[PDB]
Structure formats: C-alpha cells, structure tokens
Design a protein around this ligand. Structure first.
Ligand SMILES: O=C(NCCCNc1nc(Nc2cccc(NC(=O)N3CCCC3)c2)ncc1I)c1cccs1
Ligand SMILES: O=C(NCCCNc1nc(Nc2cccc(NC(=O)N3CCCC3)c2)ncc1I)c1cccs1
Ligand SMILES: [Cl-]
Ligand SMILES: [Cl-]
Lengths: 618, 618
C-alpha cells in the first residue's frame, strides 16, 4: 500500500476516514512527531475563493468544532490539503450503530450531545457561518481529558435529515432554521435510535411517501411512522416507550423538538428561542427521587436557584402527589425541606441514592413501564449485507432486555431500601407517641387521682369523667400493643417477603445476560467485517453460517432468562409490594389516630391541673 | 498457512496456544459444528501406557479441571491428539501480565483463584493424581456463565515454583506437599504480582543465590528479596504494603503461606490441614466496616454462624477499639447488635455502604497506608524486548497510582457520609436529653415549688436545697444552648469544611488518570506486538521510538496529577478530619455529662414527690 504526502505529513490511502463529492479524509501522521491527524484532500475554483474560506476556518477556535491546524500542498501535485484534528472515536453515527444505542443514547450521553451540538452551532452563528447539513456523521466524538465525550462539528460548507423545502432540492433563495430541522431529526435519532419520519421500507425507496409524511405532519407531532406497506402513518408528539430518557427529560425535550420540526417556517422557533430553550434544559441540575408507593424512579430537572416549593411542584407533575402530601426520606431519615430552600443546597442524590417520597394517600403501584420487544426472525438465506444488519438488530433487542433487567433490579433494590427506612420511621413515630402517652398517663395516674384524693355533685362528675379518660387510655394501650406487634418480626407489616421475592444482585441476572450479549456482539462485529470484505472463502463462509445460528441460540437463551427469571420474579415482588403498601398506609393511619387521641387526652388533663386549687380566704 | 487435522477437527499451526517438551497445544475447530477446542498433539512409549492414562483423564469430571473430550488420530500420521476444552482467556499467567495486576489481583479475583485452585487440587487428590508442577501458566481462566472467572487446572503429568528438593533436580524418591510449595508461590504471586523469592537480577541468572534463599529461609518468612547485587536478603512474614488485599484477608492468608512454604517437609502442613485451613477462609462472609476516627476501611472475615461477640472481637483486632467502646452506625442510624446475633442476619454491607464504627475514646487518624512508588527511568536505547517489559512496568506504576487515587476518593466519601450521619446522631442525643430535662424541669417548676407552696427548720432546708437544683438546672440550660449552637451551621462542629476539602467525584480525578492510563496501555500492548514481531520496518521503528517518549510523558502527567492533586488535597482533608474528630469527642463527652446531671436531678426530684404528703390522723 502506498501514500501521498506533503512537506509535513504522510498517509496511506487505505486509511481513509471519509468520502464526499468534494474531497476525501484520511488519517495520517506528522512526519517529525508521528502524531495522528485527519488529512482532507480535495479532488478537482476560483482558486482563491478557497484560500480565503480556508483562512476563515483556520481562525475558528472552539471546543465543539473539529480544529483546522494548517493548509499544505500535497507533494505529487500542488493540490491543497487541510490538516485537521483527528478524532479516533469517529462520529455520532458510529456511536448510534453500537447495538447498545439501538433504542437511544444513555441519558448522560444524550445531554452531552445536546450541549455540544448547541455549543458548536452557536459558535458558527456567532461568527455568521451556516452549516447547511448537520447529521450524526458530521458530528465527531472525542474522549475528553476527564474521560467524558466531547462532540465536535466538522464538514460545514442527507435525505433523512433535510428539511421539506430542502428535500425537494431553488438553492434556498436568499438568507438558520433549515439547520434547526436537521438538528431536530438528529436529536430525535440520538434520543430513540430511530429516524422520526419513516415510510414503510426505507426513506430511500420511498422518497415520495417521505415528503408526504414531512409536509402533511400535524403540528406538535415529532414523528410519523408507516408500519405496513402502503399503510397509514402513525403520528406522535411523544417519545416511544422504548426510549431510555427519563420522563423528567422527555417532558422538556419534546416541546423543543415539536417546535423545531415545524414545516411552516412562519412558526418554526427561530434560533435564539431555540438557544434559550435548550440552554434552560442544559443549565438544570437533576435531583433523583423515587416514589415508593408507585415503584417509580424519577429525575427532577430543576435550576440551582429554584426553591423546594418548585421542587414539590415538579415532583407532583410526575407522581400526582400534591405538595402537602409529599413526605421525603433520605439516607435513613426524614427529609424536611423548608419551602424556600434552594435546590443547590439539597442533599446530593444519585439513581442508587435518591430521595424517597411517600404519601398517606393511596396510589396505584405502577412499577417500570417498558416496551415488550421480541426477537426478529433470522432469514436462513446467506447474505453478507443482510446478516450484518440483522445481527445488529437482534443484538439491539438483547441489549434492551439487558438494560430493562438492570432497571428492574434497581427498582427492587430501591424498594427494599425504601421499605426498610420507612419501617424504622413509622417505628420512631410509634415510639414518639408511645412516649407522649406514658408521659400524659403520668398526669391521670399521678395527678388527678392522687391530687384530689388528698384531703357538695360536680366532683362526682369529675372523678367519673376522668375515669372515662383512663378508660379511654386503656383503649389506646391495646391499640398500640397491636401496632407494635404488627411492626415486629411476626407482624403483618414485616420486611421478610422482600428478601424472598423478586431478584437480588447475588442472582447475577444482569451479568448472565451481558455474557450472552457479549457473545452476540463479537459475532455482530465480525458480520460487520464480513460485510466490508465482499465475499468469504469456503471455511469463513461456513463459520459465518454457523455463527448466524449461534446468534439466534444466544438471543433465545437471553430472552428466555429475561422473561422467565427477571420479569417473572419482578412481577411477583411488585404484586407483593402492592399488598404491603396498603397494609402500611392503614397502619400509619391508625397510629396517627392513636396519636391524636393522645393529644386530646393530654390537653384536657392539662386543664384540670389547675382545677385542683381554689382561691382561699386571706 | 496450513493445517493438520483429524476425522473431526482441524487447526492452523500458526494458532498455537502452548509448547512443552512432550506436546503442543493449538486452537482448532470441530469441522461439523465449527466449535473451538484446544488440540493437544504429541511429538514423538510404551504405546498403551498412554491410552490408559488418557482414558483415566477422559473420565475426570470437575468444574476446576480443563475438560478432556476425546482422543483422536491425526490424519497425516496415526499420532494421537487430545481434544480439550478451549479457554479463550488464557491462563493465570496471562492475567498477571496485565499491568493492572502488577501489584496483585483484586481481592475478589484472588478469592476465586484461591477457591478454584484448591477445588481442582482436591479433585485430583480425591482421584489420587498428583500434579507435579502447578503454576499460573498451568491454571486456565474461563468466563463462567454468570460472568465470573472459573479457574481450571490442565497439563498434569518452573524454576521459580519448584520446591528446594525439586530445585536441585532423585526423582522425588517414593511417594503432595511438594505441590503445596508451588501453590504457595502461586498464591503469593497472585496476591502481590511478584515471586516471593528473588535473587538480585533474576532467578534464571542466579540459580545459586535462589537455592540459598529458599533453603536458608527462616521459619515464618513468606518472602526473601535481594535488593542489591551480591547484597543481603530482606526477609518478611508479611505481605508487601503495595498489596491490594485487605488486612482482614492478609491476616488469614499469611499463616497459610508460611506453613506451606516450609522447607523441612517434617513441618510442612500436609494437604488435609491445608485443605481445612483454606476452606475455613473460603467459607467466611465479609462484613465491611469503616472506622470513622481512624479513616480506615476494613473487611471482617466472619462465618455465617459467628455471633456479634466474635464480630466485635474481629473489629477490635483491626482497629484496637475494644468491644464495649464500639459504636455502630448503618444507613443513617445507630446499629445495635445483640451479642448472640449471627453474622448471617447482620445488615448487608459493601465497601461503599459499610457499617461505621466510632468510639468515645481517642484514636489516631491513620487514613490509607500505601507504597510510594515512582516511575522507573526509561532507557533511551531501542530494544523490542527491553521496551515491552519497561512499558509493562511503567504502566503498572500508573495503574497502582490510579488504584490508590480511587481508594483515596472512597475514604473521603465515606468520611463525609459517616460525619453527616454521626452529626444527626449526636443531634438526636441532644434532643433526647433536652426532652428529658424539660420533662424534669416540669417537676421542679410544677411540683415542688407549686405543691408545697399550697397551704417548725427542715422545710427551710428543703425549699433552699431545691433552689440549688433549679440553680443546677440553670447551669445545664446554658451548657445545652452552647452545644446546640455548636451543632448548628455556625458551629465549631460544622460539616462545611468536608465539602471544601479533599477531592470529590465531580472532580473526575480517577477518570483523568484512567484516560492517561489507557493511552499507556495501548502502547504497552503494541510493544508486546513489536516484541513478538522480531524487527520493525523503518517507519514502525520510528513510531515505536516516538511512543516510547509518549509513555513517559503520559506517565509523568499522571504522577504529577496524582501527587499534586489527589494526594495533596487528600492530606488536607485528613488533617482537617483529625481536628473535627477531636472537637466531636469533646462535645459528646460534655453532652454525656449534661445527660447524667439530668438523671441525677431527675431522681432526687423523684424522691420529694412523696415527701409532700404526711400521714394523717384518721
Ligand atoms: O464526513 C466528513 N468528514 C468528517 C468525518 C471524517 N472526518 C474526520 N474523521 C475523524 N476521525 C474518524 C475516526 C474514526 C472513524 C471516522 N469516521 C467514521 O467511522 N465514519 C464516518 C461516517 C462513516 C463512519 C472518523 N477525524 C477527523 C475528521 I475531519 C466528510 C465528508 C466529505 C468530505 S469530509
Ligand atoms: O501449558 C500447557 N497447556 C495449557 C495452556 C495451553 N492449553 C490450553 N490453552 C487454552 N487456551 C488458551 C487461550 C489463550 C491463551 C492461551 N495461553 C496463553 O496465552 N499462554 C500460555 C502461557 C503463555 C501464555 C491458552 N485452552 C485450552 C488449553 I489445554 C502445555 C504445555 C505443554 C504441553 S501442554
Ligand atoms: Cl471534515
Ligand atoms: Cl494442556
């Protein structure tokens, strides 16, 4: 294999990173240092319209823009090459081909994409550049020095991403929102793993159904899918259920998408509003909350400067528990947020260490809501392109199952923890009120009896009325004994079942699934190599056919384990939780009542304390 | 490349897994399924001494023994091949070459190795086989179906691992412990990343110093290292400081090693005792405990059936806090273990969620104790063998730094959590005693004054003596106000500094280090490839020299970040903890005193309650 070069760099033609009509991108090295760079080489005026536009870029300096170092002359010809920042990881496209992201990026990653695309976008605009076609292949990923992805825009100056006016194909007239469209599609694709507008078959074969979908899209819809050949379009303003993003994030993103995926440029958002709206999301912090009675996890997207009041409102939006019914638990103890306490001063939370919320009012136990996705059928006919894409799809289904199994395990672990804490909490209450009582029994038994016992009627009415109180306290004692016994080891309120039901970390169900998944992923990546390599030799051919069966046998094993082990035991744990919750609410409601009687007893005794002493002559 | 085969399998000669004097091991496939297997082929009597010993093995069935499926005839010759279980991961040797394990295996992995080596060993013995030479290259690793390693013995029937009698080289006379020796060396190597007996330079060049080390080893020593040329030997009965294993595990393992690394076979352990002793370790569960005043994490190795009593004893061994001074905290609240409560019923713990222990008695704040390891110098002379081994070594140092930085971050995170909990705990105490007090003030202010106020001396002495009590309670009130103000936001006992000092997860120091480490590890693995490939072409040669500089620049960047950021801020946080601890102990000791006065007041008032009422004529 051989190489072109310039004064300072050199590169294999085999080591190509990208191909456009205008130019090609290879990875090469600086000859003096050995350092990796992307070399952009143009295949072809006016001569200096380019040296100028090249110069403008060489000046651009920004975190979210692939850097243009220098411009050089290839040695063989006086052709211009651009030396650009090499990004070993590739593009957002590469990321979304990972079977792991078949149903959307992980939330944190999606947020980085959102941030960086928006940042790069702005920078161009600030400098007045318009990037006509933003798409995942345009958006380069790099590992930052802190290990987090940094996304970077390159190649400024695809059907599925072109605006309706653009899809037709008259140079856009005279000047951007059209950019917002492809950003709209890009973000949706990153959020869900899918293109938002999908004629049956492909957009490619059905360019016409596709334009009909995009133009005739009702307002608010963010997707339209044709599920059958020549069938109708299903519209939605919602994220698909299979999407990983939290309800907290979904609720914020959806409106941004609806408003930048608008056909009439009359009512598109306009950039600034888009910048303002996206930044409002990006500037929020996340507080993790888990709803114990609903068996649901939540992310609350809240500004640093927002109050607890707003926090309760946000929680209410996702749970339907009104502010005043919201009872908070954190790290074993009650959390009491003063209304005006800023979110920046709330205690630190994670998905594994959330703030729990409980109500004294009945809620339906929801649990995790997820798509039921079954394996596609494997087509026995051998095909290097077909099998690669099928391998991707089936591995995608198993990863999803794996992701859901992990969430299912988390939900049960949080439940077990939440329940443990709440029981010790109720237990405190029982002891707080059981103290008070013994402390007021002290007045009946010590004062009224013993005080007036010391030496016409009303007195006959007082000693007897008081007896009704000790009588009333006796009704209290036996109702507390009943609650204590319920809170104890034998009790109807016991923890035990939660250790007996569902699945536990030590079961290693997630790990068992990942092992199977890793087997499928090696095969998928090989089918990726088998595709690129256009024909296999006899043995390799056979081996490829074998592994096509192995994929399926691995995928079936996984789905069976998922449904019969993970889902089954999970549903058993949930149904038991439903019952334990109802008993708990009823118990707390009795104890409350026993607590209020204690106050009502306590204060009448607090009146007759004085009645012992009359005025005296003197 | 071409292949031998048999009726049912075939294999490249390039795809070799192992080479001994007697035979070779390649990886091949079943021709009908495509499945991977290890093919052992013998290079050479009596003819059937072998078909018999082959048959014995084909019968062996055990989790920790590489499985022998069948015996077949190679096609070209009637030579015998063994078809064996293929283990894609390789051997314990491969694992210990990973720069990640330069200073020993992670604790969990070490325990699996221990378990599996012991299990396989026993199985052979149960069947009466003796494996003369156990070593990491003998011990095969496989990923189990739950994702955990399973280790498996193969090749039954190295200098560094041979017993002193064996090192000499008379067929061992007539018959095992000699096996125990190599197990001794193997476990030590797995625990520390190093051979226990090391002449300066290598064992290879110094076969003679090596035998002198092993034979002249004082009893109890588990290692002897010659650190200078012709220098003396440093002996130890302890694990090196750089070893990852917990003190809890070290304390148990060390005696096993001392007793199976014994020269006089008179006083070696003998297998059964070894089996009993190792199993005693393997059958223990681990309870994670964190000592708040010492800033130390601990693993308590305890049987399921052991009592809390034993638990306290074990904790005392590692902390020097006697049982009765041990105060336990778990998930925000006090933990009170009944003496006879079984460890199996203790609450579940992890390193991130330990039981905290505190004392009311002063302890030195120790923190984490770790080796200071600096980068070796990089030798500028180009050498494919030399550079590979150097790349390994320098990457090993950085991984260690990374491992320590992670532990350092954990220790600070646990401190912050522990302190948070303890403060709410002390806070409870303040409120428990501040209740009691107001509850007894009720008797002074309500009863004695008001009771005898109602209508010769001693009475003159009582009203005045009582005044000394309200007087005494007034001394109490202002001392509580003082403690409350200390426990509040302004207080000398505040949390604030802990958020201001040390390093936090959001700093991403561990991630910054891993990124650097990953760069070094790609280079190391390439130098591994450059070594195997005996000479590099001019460019590759240059590129290899460049990256040899890149390693160093990456390693320096890492060490600088480690010492100047991780270690520095950590040491600042620790020094502040030292001070906060002392204030806390002093505060708790005052509150205790204020709590006891409250009892002493409370009970004298409890006597004069009766003194109000004399006997009456009637
Ligand atoms: O698209 C284009 N330019 C941007 C992309 C090519 N440019 C660069 N690439 C990288 N590094 C890099 C590393 C690994 C993989 C890849 N790419 C892929 O894996 N891909 C591409 C989509 C098919 C999958 C790229 N560094 C810097 C650049 I500048 C162009 C199209 C037409 C003209 S320029
Ligand atoms: O040592 C020996 N037999 C046991 C080892 C060879 N046998 C097997 N190997 C594997 N799989 C496997 C996979 C990847 C790597 C490797 N090995 C290595 O990476 N190594 C070897 C130490 C040098 C590093 C092995 N499967 C099954 C077997 I059976 C022998 C020595 C002399 C005769 S037999
Ligand atoms: Cl480009
Ligand atoms: Cl072998």
């Amino acid at each position: 294999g051989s190489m072109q070069s310039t004064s300072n760099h050199l590169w294999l033609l085999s080591d190509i990173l990208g191909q456009g009509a205008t130019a090609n991108v290879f990875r090469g090295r600086h000859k003096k240092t050995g350092d990796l760079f992307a070399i952009k080489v143009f295949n072809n005026r006016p001569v200096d319209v380019q040296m100028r536009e090249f110069e403008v870029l060489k000046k651009l300096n920004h975190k979210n823009i692939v850097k243009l170092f220098a411009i050089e002359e290839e040695t063989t010809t006086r052709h211009k090459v651009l030396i650009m920042e090499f990004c070993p990881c590739g593009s957002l496209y590469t990321v979304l081909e990972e079977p792991s992201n078949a149903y959307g990026l992980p939330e944190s990653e999606f947020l980085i994409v959102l941030r960086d695309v928006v940042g790069g976008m702005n920078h161009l605009r600030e400098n007045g550049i318009v990037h006509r076609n933003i798409k995942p292949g345009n958006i380069m990923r790099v590992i930052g020095e802190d290990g987090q992805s940094v996304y970077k825009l390159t190649d400024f100056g695809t059907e599925e991403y072109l605006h309706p006016d653009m899809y037709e194909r008259v140079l856009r007239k005279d000047h951007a929102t059209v950019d917002l469209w492809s950003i709209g599609v890009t973000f949706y694709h990153a959020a869900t793993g899918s293109l938002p507008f999908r004629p049956f078959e492909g957009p490619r074969r059905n360019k016409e159904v596709m334009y009909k979908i995009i133009t005739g899209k009702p307002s608010g819809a963010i997707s339209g899918v044709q599920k059958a050949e020549n069938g109708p379009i299903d519209w939605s303003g919602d994220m698909p259920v299979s999407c990983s993003l939290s309800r907290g994030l979904q609720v914020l993103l959806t409106p941004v998408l609806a408003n930048i995926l608008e056909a009439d440029q009359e009512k598109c958002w306009g950039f600034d509003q888009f910048f303002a709206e996206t930044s409002d999301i990006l500037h929020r912090m996340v507080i993790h909350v888990f709803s114990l009675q609903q068996m649901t996890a939540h992310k609350i997207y809240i500004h640093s400067y927002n109050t607890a009041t707003i926090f309760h409102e946000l929680v209410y939006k996702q749970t339907k528990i009104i502010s005043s019914n919201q009872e908070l638990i954190y790290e074993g103890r009650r959390l009491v947020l003063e209304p005006g306490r800023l979110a920046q001063h709330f205690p630190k939370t994670t998905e594994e260490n959330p703030i729990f919320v409980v109500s004294r009012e009945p809620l339906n136990t929801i649990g995790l809501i997820y798509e039921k996705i079954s394996l596609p059928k494997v087509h026995p006919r051998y095909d290097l392109d077909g099998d690669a894409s099928m391998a991707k799809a089936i591995t995608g289904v198993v990863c999803y199952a794996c992701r859901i199994a992990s969430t299912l395990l988390l939900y049960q672990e949080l439940m077990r923890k939440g329940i443990r804490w709440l029981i010790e909490l109720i237990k405190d209450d029982y002891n707080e009120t059981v103290h008070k009582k013994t402390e007021v029994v002290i007045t009946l038994d010590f004062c009224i009896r013993n005080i007036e016992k010391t030496v016409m009627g009303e007195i006959s009415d007082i000693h007897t009325k008081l007896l009704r109180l000790s009588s009333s306290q006796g009704t209290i004692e036996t109702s507390l004994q009943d609650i204590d016994s319920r809170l104890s080891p034998g009790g109807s309120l016991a923890d035990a079942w939660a250790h007996q039901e569902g699945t536990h970390p030590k079961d290693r169900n997630v790990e068992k699934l990942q092992v199977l998944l890793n087997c499928m992923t090696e095969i998928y990546y090989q089918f990726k190599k088998d595709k690129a390599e256009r024909r296999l030799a006899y043995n390799e051919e056979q081996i490829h056919k074998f592994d096509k069966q192995k994929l399926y046998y691995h995928a079936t094993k996984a789905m069976t384990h998922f449904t019969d082990e993970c889902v089954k035991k999970y549903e058993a744990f949930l149904n038991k939780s439903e019952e334990w919750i109802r008993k708990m609410l009823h118990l707390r409601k009795q104890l409350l009542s026993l607590t209020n009687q204690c106050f009502d007893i306590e204060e009448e005794v607090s009146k007759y304390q004085e009645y012992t002493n009359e005025l005296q002559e003197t």
